[PDB]
Scaffold this active site. Structure first.
Site, mmCIF file in Angstrom:
data_model
loop_
_atom_site.group_PDB
_atom_site.id
_atom_site.type_symbol
_atom_site.label_atom_id
_atom_site.label_comp_id
_atom_site.label_asym_id
_atom_site.label_seq_id
_atom_site.Cartn_x
_atom_site.Cartn_y
_atom_site.Cartn_z
ATOM 1 N N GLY A 1 3.933 6.353 9.775
ATOM 2 C CA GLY A 1 5.272 6.013 9.266
ATOM 3 C C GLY A 1 5.811 4.747 9.897
ATOM 4 O O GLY A 1 6.961 4.394 9.583
ATOM 5 N N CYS B 1 4.437 1.758 9.479
ATOM 6 C CA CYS B 1 4.180 0.691 8.479
ATOM 7 C C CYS B 1 5.521 0.155 7.969
ATOM 8 O O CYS B 1 6.425 0.973 7.737
ATOM 9 C CB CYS B 1 3.331 1.205 7.319
ATOM 10 S SG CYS B 1 1.577 1.456 7.720
ATOM 11 N N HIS C 1 0.848 -1.224 0.000
ATOM 12 C CA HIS C 1 0.000 0.000 0.000
ATOM 13 C C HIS C 1 0.872 1.258 0.000
ATOM 14 O O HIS C 1 0.302 2.355 0.082
ATOM 15 C CB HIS C 1 -1.031 0.003 1.142
ATOM 16 C CG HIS C 1 -0.488 0.318 2.497
ATOM 17 N ND1 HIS C 1 0.138 1.519 2.795
ATOM 18 C CD2 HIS C 1 -0.520 -0.389 3.644
ATOM 19 C CE1 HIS C 1 0.502 1.515 4.058
ATOM 20 N NE2 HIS C 1 0.110 0.355 4.600
HETATM 21 C C1 LIG Z 1 1.393 3.166 8.105
HETATM 22 N N1 LIG Z 1 2.260 4.054 7.806
HETATM 23 C C2 LIG Z 1 0.076 3.482 8.825
HETATM 24 C C3 LIG Z 1 0.196 3.263 10.336
HETATM 25 C C4 LIG Z 1 -1.038 3.754 11.094
HETATM 26 C C5 LIG Z 1 -1.262 5.261 11.198
HETATM 27 C C6 LIG Z 1 -2.116 5.405 12.446
HETATM 28 N N2 LIG Z 1 -1.644 4.290 13.262
HETATM 29 C C7 LIG Z 1 -1.095 3.309 12.543
HETATM 30 O O1 LIG Z 1 -0.721 2.208 12.977
HETATM 31 N N3 LIG Z 1 -1.023 2.700 8.273
HETATM 32 C C8 LIG Z 1 -1.831 3.177 7.309
HETATM 33 O O2 LIG Z 1 -1.624 4.237 6.718
HETATM 34 C C9 LIG Z 1 -3.055 2.335 6.961
HETATM 35 C C10 LIG Z 1 -3.081 2.078 5.462
HETATM 36 C C11 LIG Z 1 -4.263 2.816 4.869
HETATM 37 C C12 LIG Z 1 -4.997 3.500 6.006
HETATM 38 N N4 LIG Z 1 -4.305 3.052 7.225
HETATM 39 C C13 LIG Z 1 -4.744 3.221 8.488
HETATM 40 O O3 LIG Z 1 -3.969 3.127 9.436
HETATM 41 C C14 LIG Z 1 -6.233 3.532 8.698
HETATM 42 N N5 LIG Z 1 -6.911 2.289 9.054
HETATM 43 C C15 LIG Z 1 -7.816 1.701 8.264
HETATM 44 O O4 LIG Z 1 -7.975 1.960 7.087
HETATM 45 C C16 LIG Z 1 -8.711 0.634 8.903
HETATM 46 F F1 LIG Z 1 -9.122 0.984 10.115
HETATM 47 F F2 LIG Z 1 -9.799 0.405 8.178
HETATM 48 F F3 LIG Z 1 -8.075 -0.523 9.031
HETATM 49 C C17 LIG Z 1 -6.593 4.693 9.678
HETATM 50 C C18 LIG Z 1 -7.944 5.298 9.259
HETATM 51 C C19 LIG Z 1 -5.534 5.808 9.647
HETATM 52 C C20 LIG Z 1 -6.722 4.191 11.124
HETATM 53 C C21 LIG Z 1 -4.190 1.308 4.776
HETATM 54 C C22 LIG Z 1 -3.843 0.710 3.429
HETATM 55 C C23 LIG Z 1 -5.236 0.498 5.516
#
Ligand SMILES: *C(=N)[C@H](C[C@@H]1CCNC1=O)NC(=O)[C@@H]1[C@@H]2[C@H](CN1C(=O)[C@@H](NC(=O)C(F)(F)F)C(C)(C)C)C2(C)C
Ligand SMILES: *C(=N)[C@H](C[C@@H]1CCNC1=O)NC(=O)[C@@H]1[C@@H]2[C@H](CN1C(=O)[C@@H](NC(=O)C(F)(F)F)C(C)(C)C)C2(C)C
Lengths: 302, 305
Positions: B143, B145, B41
């Protein structure tokens, strides 16, 4: 989101851990440049543990009595001096994995990471606080001695603790890296016991601020308190007195959350009065006191 | 003595963390041999996260779309491929700090060490369990991820987890290093929730054994139960069933303490029904289920390298 008791990456310290052997005693050493630091009681037999004369025992030792081993390589010992309760072994090789480092003596309340080692091999890493009574609530078995506590700041490793001994109550005592014991302990097997422990009040408030920022508001209230009325009440639950200095340190978390420190102090008094009524804060049913104001900012904004 | 939530040393794994940038998305990569592994992603924009077509988004991307940075040094991407939900970028250079490693996939209840990273720079290590509902209760900001979960067995790093997303409940979801999700989750921004969690029964019992070894013995009672009778209590309190498998694993701790597993079950049963009646166990007011039997032995006796 989330909140974890979280240690520093141990990599930089793993690169410094060696095994120091003398007679039947084997414990761990810290190899920085061409010096191995380890607890001086390595030179004690079982007998000389009661009233060791370190100056007399050490003068009996030549360089060649100390087997230093880094993984497979035996280091050749070319010098020994004592500084307080740590033995310093000069070796013929500067450690090539030596990080940027300093030695720092910490104050009660301060957190740091411990790399538990056995035979100069790192076993595990966990996060500790210096208790008010100068002990740490560690996890250490036989041969763990010479395991170190540290912080890492950018690329600089701050060594603050070297492990020496376990007290009867199961809490641990050690020295800074100049070998001065934290607290009123001595590296002898004598009747010595940890003082009465207290809760690190400044840390509990910090942890409550972390709870708020992570979106938990069930424990606050509409009261405030005077610093004096706070301390008078808290101290009846064996809480460390909160000082003006502690309030100052909470400035940033107070501002970020917009809850005055004395308001959060009011919340704490009521939490002590009431307990949890089932509920939890940040996944704990006790009040956590091993997160400093700095630890909260780093994990919730960094 | 003493008992701590204890992580494996992170050194071998710190040597593998890199920064991966695709457009305005930056997150973390794991660099092993001449390939970098990171969440697929990374290629998604804010728009593309709502209904991503990975095969389509990926085929529209050339290697020049991928910045891979190990510290201050740029790594050159000479190839890119997808496996399930992980992007694999072939880089021009093999990582000289690559450890002995394998990819393993864990079951709920198994524990592992997480190295939390930002901009390819390791920030902290903590101990986690794969929850029964296939989430983990992590600490991860923007960040994070591409942060990985691992265990170490001697010199072999077994990578088991890569971080993808945060669920609205504040818990975390990710994949094994082959990009297969843990739990019924998808890497789209769409609305997702953790199913209802349960307590990992075998782990509490292992933790209660760890308590006994450290002289915290007040909760032992004279009574014993049966697996059938216990598991009826378990279900009511949202506890994972105890299996014949689970009981056998505890043989070492039963033998070491002289406390029969179904005896320990009686203590546990009674605790769920009665609460802790003031007391704590190893300084917890909660029953702790994130220490495995192997975790307890590796700390309370040895086998700790
Ligand atoms: C990676 N860099 C982040 C880490 C996140 C940021 C907030 N806390 C964390 O652990 N992960 C993401 O950017 C992922 C990514 C898109 C959106 N996302 C989310 O963390 C979102 N979650 C969801 O989409 C959910 F809940 F449906 F699983 C958020 C709305 C920010 C909680 C993808 C591909 C899921
Ligand atoms: C180093 N390898 C051990 C570490 C201990 C062993 C059990 N868990 C630990 O953390 N250090 C020692 O063996 C030190 C050493 C003499 C005795 N000692 C002790 O730890 C003992 N403590 C004391 O006698 C006390 F309380 F007085 F400090 C003991 C309780 C028997 C484990 C010296 C020089 C202190």
């Amino acid at each position: 989101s989330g909140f974890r008791k979280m240690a520093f990456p141990s990599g930089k310290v793993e690169g410094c851990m060696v095994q120091v052997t003398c007679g039947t005693t084997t414990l761990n050493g810290l190899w920085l440049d061409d010096v191995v630091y380890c607890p001086r009681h390595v030179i004690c037999t079982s007998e000389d543990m009661l009233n060791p004369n370190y100056e007399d025992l050490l003068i009996r030792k030549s360089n060649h009595n100390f087997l230093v081993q880094a993984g497979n390589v035996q280091l050749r010992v070319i010098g020994h001096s004592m500084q307080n309760c740590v033995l310093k072994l000069k070796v013929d090789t500067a450690n090539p994995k030596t990080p940027k480092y300093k030695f720092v003596r910490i104050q009660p309340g301060q957190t740091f990471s411990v790399l538990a080692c056995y035979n100069g091999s790192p076993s595990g890493v966990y996060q500790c606080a210096m208790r008010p009574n100068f002990t740490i609530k560690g996890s250490f078995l036989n041969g763990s001695c010479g395991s170190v506590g540290f912080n890492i700041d950018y690329d600089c490793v701050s060594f603050c603790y070297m492990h020496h001994m376990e007290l009867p109550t199961g809490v641990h005592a050690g020295t800074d890296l100049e070998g001065n014991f934290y607290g009123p302990f001595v590296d002898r097997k004598t009747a010595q016991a940890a003082g009465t422990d207290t809760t690190i009040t400044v840390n509990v408030l910090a942890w409550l601020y972390a709870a708020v920022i992570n979106g938990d508001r069930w424990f606050l209230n509409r009261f405030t308190t005077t610093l004096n009325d706070f301390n008078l009440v808290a101290m009846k639950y064996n809480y460390e007195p909160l000082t003006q200095d502690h309030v100052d340190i909470l400035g940033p978390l107070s501002a970020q959350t917009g809850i005055a420190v004395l308001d959060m102090c009011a919340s704490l008094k009521e939490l002590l009065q009431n307990g949890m009524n089932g509920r939890t804060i940040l996944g704990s049913a006790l009040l956590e006191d091993e997160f400093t104001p700095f630890d909260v900012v780093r994990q919730c904004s960094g």
